[PDB]
Amino acid sequence: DRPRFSFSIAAREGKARTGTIEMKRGVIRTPAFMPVGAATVKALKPETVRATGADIILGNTYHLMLRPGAERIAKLGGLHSFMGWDRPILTDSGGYQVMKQSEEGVTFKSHSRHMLSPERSIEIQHLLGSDIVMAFDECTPYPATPSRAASSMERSMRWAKRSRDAFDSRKEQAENAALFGIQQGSVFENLRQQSADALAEIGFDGYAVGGLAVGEGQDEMFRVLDFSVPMLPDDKPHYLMGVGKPDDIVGAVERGIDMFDCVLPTRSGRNGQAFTWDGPINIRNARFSEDLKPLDSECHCAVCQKWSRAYIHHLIRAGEILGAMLMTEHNIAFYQQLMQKIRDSISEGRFSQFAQDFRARYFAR
Amino acid sequence: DRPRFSFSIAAREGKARTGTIEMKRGVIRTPAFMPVGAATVKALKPETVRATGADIILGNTYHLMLRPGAERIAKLGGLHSFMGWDRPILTDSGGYQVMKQSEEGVTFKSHSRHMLSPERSIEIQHLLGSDIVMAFDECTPYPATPSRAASSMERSMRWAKRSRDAFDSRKEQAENAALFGIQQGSVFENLRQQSADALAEIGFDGYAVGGLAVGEGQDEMFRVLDFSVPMLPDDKPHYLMGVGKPDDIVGAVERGIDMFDCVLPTRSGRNGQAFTWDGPINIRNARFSEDLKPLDSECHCAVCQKWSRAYIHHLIRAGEILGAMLMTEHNIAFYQQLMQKIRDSISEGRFSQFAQDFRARYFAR
Ligand SMILES: Nc1nc2[nH]cnc2c(=O)[nH]1
Ligand SMILES: Nc1nc2[nH]cnc2c(=O)[nH]1
Ligand SMILES: [Zn+2]
Ligand SMILES: [Zn+2]
């Protein structure tokens, strides 16, 4: 009864947009942050992930195809049933993480040798029962010569067409899921343009900006976004893969990005870093040992309603699992509250002021 | 408004009893199992601990006096506030875990040298804000000569009197908390009798059987319980410290024990062992990789409502925190459901049949 995929832009401010993606398993409010999930968002039950405000999570073809295996997950009823998350899941395509390359695909050894190709990647994502399927692309190293960036991007575009065809051949997948293409081209405007043109000629439900989670720094990332995002179709979602810190997200939204994923909130949380509106803090630091305030005194999350910095400091220093649980829940909730403030401010025509106020306070520390 | 400590026996069957302990922070249904908590029941939020049915948890003087420190916990508002558990907490006294002994107390080095004595143990437990305070006792090694068991037990009884006096001197503690004595005497009936007599002459709110979590095996433990529990005052709770496996608990209840604590459900859970009515299972075993049944198909816990053996097998093999969370919640819930079945069967006059049926199925596997 519900739409397969319908993106609607409710409001804009500059290049920023806010809206919704309606899918069969739920609505995704944009700009959106996707928590990253080995068939788990680390240290969180799915109900807790949802309680933080997340509408969609990310799963990884590369990990799940090895453990527990794609056919096995399908036999067990699909990834949603397996992990107990009934809302949308976006799966990355696997070629990027895994990085022997050839025109056919990539061969690799598990940490046993396996192969991935556009066709196999689409099939794996089908067996998992993904809602948003990513085209199978190639990682371009950074830095790269223009010529190597070009040949990598061109192979990715041929693989994008193969991904489109494989997805469209599987009628249940094409009826129930969406397919996103991935723009490549390293930091080079002409290659980014050729990549955007190729992807739009194939046609996708959404367009990711790939190849920018590669250590280039925020200034260069923003420079590339400045020219790259306008090349993508305006009427489809724009997904910046693997980004990022809170300020990266704000600046990327200012440049027209609608969707994000990053391991930072989960990974940092486990390692004692909590995100706050006054910047990140390292909860293991001695200065928190008697601090009865919550991690952030404006955060609405359940952790900040119930436990102090002092307690969480104690747990993390003791290596206690509950410490990782509480830090991760707070960090994912912080990211979701950031996205909510972004959405509300764009809707209300005050996103420019929000971004300025956010940066002033976040970097004052 | 609520009672400091009121034990009522509602029903009996043989030596088994069922009833309630009313305290200021809540009611404890007996026979009771206390999950063990570094100011956390490992991998569980307090609300989850409560959702499993637990009425009371155990905390440890020895660990908390070093990390984060007893004065520090008191400055932060007490252990209940610090960890977010508002119901009763029983604290062990520290002398046992820590095991230089003298009549004054025990000196030890942290894994810095510290001292514990009856007076300091009571003070630490006061600073933590414990509801049930344990007398400061000595660990008798197993095996022990009769003479060494006697001298150890006698020192423990002198320390029990010092514990009583220190507790009674602190009027807020004596008004709001309860004090339990600990019977010692190794495996020797005459020493167990002398110990029970000394404790009853001092007078306590409850009586623990100490010195039986020492590797003697179930047959010998039961033999000692057979004569030791009847020596304790009938009208106060009987607490078997550090026990045990499900069958240990059932047999100990048959011998008049009302309260238990053990790390098994939490520790085993993290290491992949799940308790079921058909005995323990090792969820990492290959036989569970495609098993869509829950950990136990009769268990009422939230884990068994929502996730399969196959998923939990995957999580534990992957080293995922959620695996430890789910295993621990299920195991603590299993223990609580065991206690509930024990309480109901005693109340209904069918505990003998329950124990027989339980053992037949648990050991059939
Ligand atoms: N498939 C894919 N995933 C990514 N995650 C971060 N960057 C990328 C990329 O370029 N491609
Ligand atoms: N204090 C104390 N704690 C225990 N836990 C298990 N056995 C004992 C004991 O004999 N004394
Ligand atoms: Zn928070
Ligand atoms: Zn269960």
Coordinates of N, CA and C in Angstrom, one line a residue, chain B residues 75-247:
Chain B
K75 N 29.7 11.5 48.2 CA 29.6 12.8 47.8 C 28.7 13.0 46.6
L76 N 28.7 12.0 45.7 CA 27.8 12.0 44.6 C 26.4 11.6 44.9
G77 N 26.1 11.3 46.1 CA 24.7 11.1 46.5 C 24.4 9.6 46.9
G78 N 25.4 8.8 46.9 CA 25.2 7.4 47.3 C 25.1 6.5 46.1
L79 N 25.3 5.2 46.3 CA 25.3 4.2 45.3 C 24.0 4.1 44.5
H80 N 22.9 4.2 45.1 CA 21.6 4.1 44.4 C 21.5 5.2 43.4
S81 N 21.8 6.5 43.7 CA 21.7 7.6 42.8 C 22.8 7.4 41.7
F82 N 24.0 7.0 42.1 CA 25.1 6.9 41.2 C 24.8 6.0 40.1
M83 N 24.3 4.8 40.4 CA 24.1 3.8 39.3 C 22.7 3.8 38.8
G84 N 21.7 4.6 39.4 CA 20.4 4.6 38.9 C 19.5 3.4 39.3
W85 N 19.7 2.8 40.4 CA 18.9 1.7 40.9 C 18.3 2.2 42.3
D86 N 17.0 2.3 42.3 CA 16.4 2.9 43.5 C 15.8 1.9 44.5
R87 N 16.0 0.6 44.2 CA 15.5 -0.4 45.1 C 16.5 -0.9 46.0
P88 N 16.3 -2.0 46.8 CA 17.3 -2.4 47.8 C 18.6 -2.9 47.1
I89 N 19.7 -2.6 47.8 CA 21.0 -3.1 47.5 C 21.6 -3.8 48.7
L90 N 22.1 -5.0 48.6 CA 22.9 -5.6 49.6 C 24.3 -5.5 49.2
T91 N 25.2 -5.0 50.2 CA 26.6 -5.0 49.9 C 27.3 -6.0 50.7
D92 N 28.2 -6.7 50.0 CA 29.1 -7.6 50.7 C 30.1 -6.8 51.4
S93 N 30.8 -7.4 52.4 CA 31.6 -6.6 53.4 C 33.0 -6.4 53.0
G94 N 33.5 -7.1 52.0 CA 34.9 -6.9 51.5 C 36.0 -7.8 52.0
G95 N 36.0 -8.2 53.2 CA 37.0 -9.1 53.7 C 37.1 -10.4 52.9
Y96 N 36.0 -10.9 52.4 CA 36.1 -12.2 51.8 C 36.7 -12.1 50.4
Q97 N 36.2 -11.2 49.6 CA 36.8 -10.9 48.3 C 38.3 -10.7 48.4
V98 N 38.7 -9.6 49.2 CA 40.1 -9.2 49.3 C 41.0 -10.4 49.5
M99 N 40.6 -11.4 50.1 CA 41.4 -12.6 50.2 C 41.1 -13.5 49.0
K100 N 47.3 -10.0 54.5 CA 47.8 -9.9 55.9 C 46.6 -9.8 56.8
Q101 N 46.3 -10.9 57.6 CA 45.3 -10.9 58.5 C 45.8 -10.7 59.9
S102 N 45.0 -9.9 60.8 CA 45.3 -9.8 62.2 C 44.0 -9.7 62.9
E103 N 44.0 -9.6 64.2 CA 42.8 -9.4 64.9 C 42.1 -8.1 64.5
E104 N 42.8 -7.1 64.2 CA 42.3 -5.8 63.8 C 41.5 -5.9 62.5
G105 N 42.0 -6.6 61.5 CA 41.3 -6.7 60.2 C 42.3 -7.3 59.2
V106 N 42.2 -6.8 57.9 CA 43.0 -7.3 56.8 C 43.7 -6.2 56.1
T107 N 44.9 -6.3 55.8 CA 45.7 -5.4 55.0 C 45.9 -6.0 53.6
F108 N 45.8 -5.2 52.6 CA 45.9 -5.7 51.2 C 46.5 -4.7 50.3
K109 N 47.0 -5.1 49.1 CA 47.4 -4.3 48.1 C 46.4 -4.3 46.9
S110 N 46.1 -3.2 46.3 CA 45.2 -3.1 45.2 C 45.9 -3.6 43.9
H111 N 45.1 -4.2 43.1 CA 45.6 -4.7 41.8 C 46.0 -3.6 40.9
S112 N 49.3 -0.3 45.8 CA 48.8 0.6 46.9 C 48.2 -0.3 48.0
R113 N 48.6 -0.1 49.2 CA 48.1 -1.0 50.3 C 47.0 -0.3 51.1
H114 N 46.0 -1.1 51.4 CA 44.8 -0.6 52.1 C 44.5 -1.6 53.3
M115 N 43.6 -1.1 54.2 CA 43.2 -1.9 55.3 C 41.6 -2.0 55.3
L116 N 41.1 -3.1 55.7 CA 39.7 -3.2 56.0 C 39.6 -3.9 57.4
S117 N 38.6 -3.4 58.1 CA 38.3 -3.9 59.5 C 36.8 -4.0 59.6
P118 N 36.2 -4.6 60.6 CA 34.8 -4.5 60.8 C 34.3 -3.1 60.8
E119 N 34.9 -2.2 61.5 CA 34.5 -0.8 61.6 C 34.6 -0.1 60.3
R120 N 35.7 -0.3 59.6 CA 35.8 0.4 58.3 C 34.8 -0.2 57.3
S121 N 34.6 -1.5 57.3 CA 33.6 -2.1 56.4 C 32.2 -1.5 56.6
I122 N 31.8 -1.5 57.8 CA 30.5 -0.9 58.1 C 30.4 0.6 57.7
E123 N 31.5 1.3 57.9 CA 31.5 2.7 57.5 C 31.4 2.8 56.0
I124 N 32.2 2.0 55.2 CA 32.1 2.0 53.8 C 30.7 1.7 53.3
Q125 N 30.1 0.7 53.9 CA 28.7 0.3 53.5 C 27.7 1.4 53.8
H126 N 28.0 2.1 54.9 CA 27.2 3.3 55.2 C 27.3 4.4 54.2
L127 N 28.5 4.7 53.8 CA 28.8 5.7 52.8 C 28.2 5.4 51.5
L128 N 28.2 4.1 51.1 CA 27.5 3.7 49.9 C 26.0 3.8 50.0
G129 N 25.4 3.7 51.2 CA 24.0 3.8 51.4 C 23.3 2.5 51.2
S130 N 24.0 1.4 51.4 CA 23.5 0.0 51.4 C 22.2 -0.2 52.2
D131 N 21.3 -1.0 51.7 CA 20.1 -1.4 52.5 C 20.3 -2.6 53.4
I132 N 21.0 -3.6 52.9 CA 21.4 -4.7 53.7 C 22.9 -4.8 53.7
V133 N 23.4 -4.6 54.9 CA 24.8 -4.5 55.3 C 25.3 -5.9 55.7
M134 N 26.4 -6.4 55.2 CA 26.9 -7.6 55.7 C 28.0 -7.4 56.7
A135 N 28.0 -8.3 57.8 CA 29.1 -8.3 58.7 C 30.4 -8.6 58.0
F136 N 31.5 -8.1 58.6 CA 32.8 -8.3 58.0 C 33.4 -9.6 58.6
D137 N 33.6 -10.5 57.7 CA 34.0 -11.9 58.0 C 35.3 -12.3 57.3
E138 N 35.8 -13.5 57.6 CA 37.0 -14.0 57.1 C 36.7 -15.2 56.2
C139 N 37.4 -15.3 55.1 CA 37.4 -16.4 54.2 C 38.1 -17.6 54.9
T140 N 37.5 -18.7 55.1 CA 38.2 -19.9 55.5 C 38.5 -20.7 54.2
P141 N 39.8 -21.0 54.0 CA 40.2 -21.8 52.8 C 39.5 -23.2 52.9
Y142 N 39.4 -23.9 51.8 CA 38.9 -25.2 51.7 C 39.9 -26.1 50.9
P143 N 40.3 -27.2 51.4 CA 40.0 -27.7 52.8 C 40.7 -27.0 53.8
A144 N 40.3 -27.1 55.1 CA 40.9 -26.5 56.2 C 40.9 -27.6 57.4
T145 N 42.0 -27.6 58.1 CA 42.0 -28.4 59.3 C 40.9 -28.0 60.3
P146 N 40.3 -28.8 61.1 CA 39.4 -28.4 62.1 C 39.9 -27.2 62.9
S147 N 41.1 -27.3 63.3 CA 41.6 -26.2 64.2 C 41.7 -24.9 63.5
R148 N 42.2 -24.9 62.2 CA 42.3 -23.7 61.5 C 40.9 -23.2 61.1
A149 N 39.9 -24.1 60.8 CA 38.6 -23.6 60.6 C 38.0 -23.0 61.9
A150 N 38.3 -23.6 63.0 CA 37.8 -23.1 64.3 C 38.4 -21.7 64.6
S151 N 39.7 -21.5 64.4 CA 40.2 -20.2 64.7 C 39.7 -19.1 63.8
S152 N 39.6 -19.5 62.5 CA 39.0 -18.6 61.5 C 37.6 -18.2 61.9
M153 N 36.8 -19.2 62.2 CA 35.4 -19.0 62.5 C 35.3 -18.1 63.8
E154 N 36.1 -18.3 64.8 CA 36.1 -17.6 66.0 C 36.4 -16.1 65.8
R155 N 37.4 -15.8 65.0 CA 37.8 -14.5 64.6 C 36.6 -13.8 63.9
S156 N 36.0 -14.6 62.9 CA 34.8 -14.0 62.2 C 33.7 -13.7 63.2
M157 N 33.5 -14.5 64.3 CA 32.4 -14.2 65.3 C 32.8 -13.0 66.1
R158 N 34.0 -12.8 66.5 CA 34.4 -11.5 67.1 C 34.2 -10.3 66.2
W159 N 34.5 -10.5 64.9 CA 34.3 -9.5 63.9 C 32.8 -9.2 63.7
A160 N 32.0 -10.2 63.9 CA 30.6 -10.1 63.7 C 30.0 -9.2 64.9
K161 N 30.5 -9.4 66.1 CA 30.1 -8.5 67.2 C 30.6 -7.1 66.9
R162 N 31.8 -6.9 66.5 CA 32.3 -5.6 66.2 C 31.5 -4.9 65.1
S163 N 31.0 -5.7 64.1 CA 30.2 -5.2 63.0 C 28.8 -4.7 63.5
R164 N 28.2 -5.5 64.4 CA 27.0 -5.2 65.1 C 27.1 -3.8 65.8
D165 N 28.2 -3.7 66.6 CA 28.4 -2.5 67.4 C 28.6 -1.3 66.5
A166 N 29.4 -1.4 65.4 CA 29.7 -0.3 64.6 C 28.4 0.2 63.9
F167 N 27.6 -0.8 63.4 CA 26.3 -0.5 62.7 C 25.4 0.2 63.7
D168 N 25.3 -0.3 64.9 CA 24.4 0.3 65.9 C 24.8 1.7 66.4
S169 N 26.0 2.0 66.3 CA 26.5 3.3 66.7 C 26.1 4.4 65.7
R170 N 25.8 4.1 64.5 CA 25.5 5.0 63.4 C 24.0 5.0 63.3
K171 N 23.4 6.0 63.9 CA 21.9 6.0 64.1 C 21.2 6.0 62.8
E172 N 21.6 6.8 61.8 CA 21.0 6.8 60.5 C 21.0 5.4 59.8
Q173 N 22.2 4.7 59.9 CA 22.3 3.4 59.4 C 21.4 2.4 60.1
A174 N 21.4 2.5 61.4 CA 20.6 1.5 62.2 C 19.1 1.7 61.9
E175 N 18.7 2.9 61.6 CA 17.3 3.2 61.4 C 16.8 2.8 60.0
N176 N 17.7 2.8 59.0 CA 17.3 2.7 57.7 C 17.8 1.4 57.0
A177 N 18.7 0.7 57.5 CA 19.3 -0.4 56.9 C 19.1 -1.6 57.8
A178 N 19.5 -2.8 57.3 CA 19.5 -4.1 58.0 C 20.9 -4.6 58.0
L179 N 21.2 -5.5 59.0 CA 22.5 -6.0 59.2 C 22.4 -7.6 59.2
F180 N 23.2 -8.2 58.4 CA 23.2 -9.7 58.4 C 24.5 -10.2 58.9
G181 N 24.4 -11.3 59.7 CA 25.6 -12.0 60.2 C 25.9 -13.2 59.2
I182 N 27.2 -13.6 59.3 CA 27.6 -14.7 58.4 C 28.2 -15.9 59.2
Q183 N 27.5 -17.0 59.0 CA 28.0 -18.2 59.7 C 29.2 -18.8 58.9
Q184 N 30.2 -19.2 59.7 CA 31.4 -19.9 59.2 C 31.5 -21.2 59.9
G185 N 32.7 -21.8 59.8 CA 32.9 -23.2 60.3 C 33.2 -24.2 59.3
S186 N 33.5 -23.8 58.1 CA 33.9 -24.8 57.0 C 32.9 -25.9 56.9
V187 N 33.2 -27.1 56.9 CA 32.3 -28.3 56.7 C 32.0 -29.0 58.0
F188 N 32.4 -28.4 59.1 CA 32.3 -29.1 60.4 C 31.1 -28.7 61.2
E189 N 30.3 -29.7 61.5 CA 29.0 -29.5 62.2 C 29.2 -28.7 63.5
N190 N 30.1 -29.2 64.3 CA 30.3 -28.5 65.6 C 30.7 -27.0 65.5
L191 N 31.5 -26.7 64.5 CA 31.9 -25.3 64.3 C 30.7 -24.5 63.8
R192 N 30.0 -25.1 62.8 CA 28.8 -24.4 62.3 C 27.8 -24.1 63.5
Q193 N 27.7 -25.1 64.4 CA 26.8 -24.8 65.6 C 27.3 -23.7 66.5
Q194 N 28.6 -23.7 66.8 CA 29.2 -22.6 67.6 C 29.0 -21.3 66.9
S195 N 29.2 -21.3 65.6 CA 29.0 -20.0 64.8 C 27.6 -19.6 64.9
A196 N 26.6 -20.4 64.6 CA 25.2 -20.1 64.7 C 24.8 -19.5 66.0
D197 N 25.4 -20.2 67.1 CA 25.0 -19.8 68.4 C 25.6 -18.4 68.7
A198 N 26.8 -18.1 68.3 CA 27.4 -16.8 68.5 C 26.6 -15.7 67.8
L199 N 26.2 -16.0 66.5 CA 25.5 -15.0 65.8 C 24.1 -14.7 66.4
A200 N 23.4 -15.8 66.8 CA 22.1 -15.6 67.4 C 22.2 -14.8 68.7
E201 N 23.3 -15.0 69.5 CA 23.5 -14.3 70.7 C 23.7 -12.8 70.5
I202 N 24.4 -12.5 69.4 CA 24.6 -11.1 69.0 C 23.3 -10.5 68.5
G203 N 22.6 -11.2 67.6 CA 21.3 -10.8 67.0 C 21.5 -10.1 65.7
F204 N 20.9 -10.6 64.6 CA 21.0 -10.0 63.3 C 19.6 -10.0 62.7
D205 N 19.5 -9.2 61.6 CA 18.3 -9.2 60.9 C 18.2 -10.4 59.9
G206 N 19.3 -10.9 59.5 CA 19.3 -12.1 58.7 C 20.6 -12.8 58.9
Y207 N 20.7 -14.1 58.4 CA 21.8 -14.9 58.7 C 22.3 -15.6 57.4
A208 N 23.5 -15.3 57.0 CA 24.1 -15.9 55.8 C 24.8 -17.1 56.2
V209 N 24.9 -18.1 55.2 CA 25.7 -19.2 55.3 C 26.9 -18.9 54.4
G210 N 28.0 -18.6 55.1 CA 29.3 -18.3 54.3 C 30.1 -19.5 54.2
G211 N 31.2 -19.4 53.4 CA 32.2 -20.4 53.3 C 31.8 -21.6 52.5
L212 N 30.7 -21.6 51.7 CA 30.3 -22.7 50.9 C 30.4 -22.5 49.4
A213 N 30.9 -21.4 49.0 CA 31.3 -21.2 47.6 C 32.8 -21.3 47.4
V214 N 33.2 -22.6 47.7 CA 34.7 -22.8 47.8 C 35.2 -24.0 47.1
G215 N 34.4 -24.6 46.1 CA 34.8 -25.7 45.3 C 34.6 -27.1 45.9
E216 N 33.8 -27.2 47.0 CA 33.6 -28.5 47.6 C 32.6 -29.4 46.9
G217 N 31.9 -28.9 45.9 CA 31.0 -29.7 45.1 C 29.6 -29.7 45.8
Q218 N 28.6 -30.0 45.0 CA 27.2 -29.9 45.4 C 26.9 -30.9 46.5
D219 N 27.4 -32.1 46.4 CA 27.0 -33.1 47.4 C 27.4 -32.7 48.8
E220 N 28.7 -32.2 48.9 CA 29.2 -31.7 50.2 C 28.5 -30.4 50.6
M221 N 28.2 -29.5 49.7 CA 27.5 -28.3 50.0 C 26.2 -28.7 50.6
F222 N 25.4 -29.6 50.0 CA 24.1 -30.0 50.5 C 24.2 -30.6 51.9
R223 N 25.2 -31.5 52.1 CA 25.5 -32.1 53.3 C 25.6 -31.1 54.5
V224 N 26.4 -30.1 54.2 CA 26.6 -29.0 55.2 C 25.4 -28.2 55.4
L225 N 24.6 -27.9 54.3 CA 23.4 -27.2 54.5 C 22.4 -28.0 55.3
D226 N 22.4 -29.3 55.1 CA 21.4 -30.2 55.8 C 21.4 -29.9 57.3
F227 N 22.6 -29.8 57.9 CA 22.7 -29.5 59.4 C 22.9 -28.0 59.7
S228 N 23.4 -27.2 58.8 CA 23.7 -25.8 59.2 C 22.5 -24.9 59.2
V229 N 21.6 -25.0 58.2 CA 20.5 -24.1 58.1 C 19.6 -24.2 59.3
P230 N 19.2 -25.4 59.8 CA 18.4 -25.5 61.0 C 19.0 -24.9 62.2
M231 N 20.3 -24.6 62.3 CA 20.9 -24.0 63.4 C 20.6 -22.5 63.5
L232 N 20.2 -21.9 62.4 CA 20.0 -20.4 62.3 C 18.6 -20.1 62.8
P233 N 18.3 -18.9 63.3 CA 17.0 -18.6 63.7 C 16.0 -18.8 62.5
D234 N 14.9 -19.5 62.8 CA 13.9 -19.7 61.8 C 13.2 -18.5 61.3
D235 N 13.1 -17.5 62.1 CA 12.3 -16.3 61.8 C 13.0 -15.2 61.1
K236 N 14.2 -15.4 60.6 CA 15.0 -14.5 59.9 C 15.4 -15.1 58.5
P237 N 15.7 -14.3 57.5 CA 16.1 -14.8 56.3 C 17.4 -15.5 56.4
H238 N 17.6 -16.5 55.5 CA 18.8 -17.4 55.4 C 19.4 -17.1 54.0
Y239 N 20.6 -16.7 53.9 CA 21.2 -16.2 52.7 C 22.5 -17.1 52.4
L240 N 22.4 -17.9 51.3 CA 23.6 -18.7 50.9 C 24.4 -17.8 49.9
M241 N 25.6 -17.4 50.4 CA 26.4 -16.5 49.6 C 27.1 -17.2 48.5
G242 N 27.1 -16.6 47.3 CA 27.9 -17.0 46.2 C 27.4 -18.3 45.4
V243 N 26.1 -18.7 45.6 CA 25.5 -19.8 45.0 C 24.3 -19.4 44.3
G244 N 24.1 -19.9 43.1 CA 24.9 -20.9 42.3 C 24.2 -21.2 41.0
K245 N 24.5 -22.4 40.6 CA 23.8 -23.0 39.4 C 22.3 -23.2 39.7
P246 N 21.5 -23.3 38.7 CA 20.1 -23.5 39.0 C 19.7 -24.6 39.9
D247 N 20.4 -25.8 39.7 CA 20.1 -26.9 40.5 C 20.6 -26.7 41.9

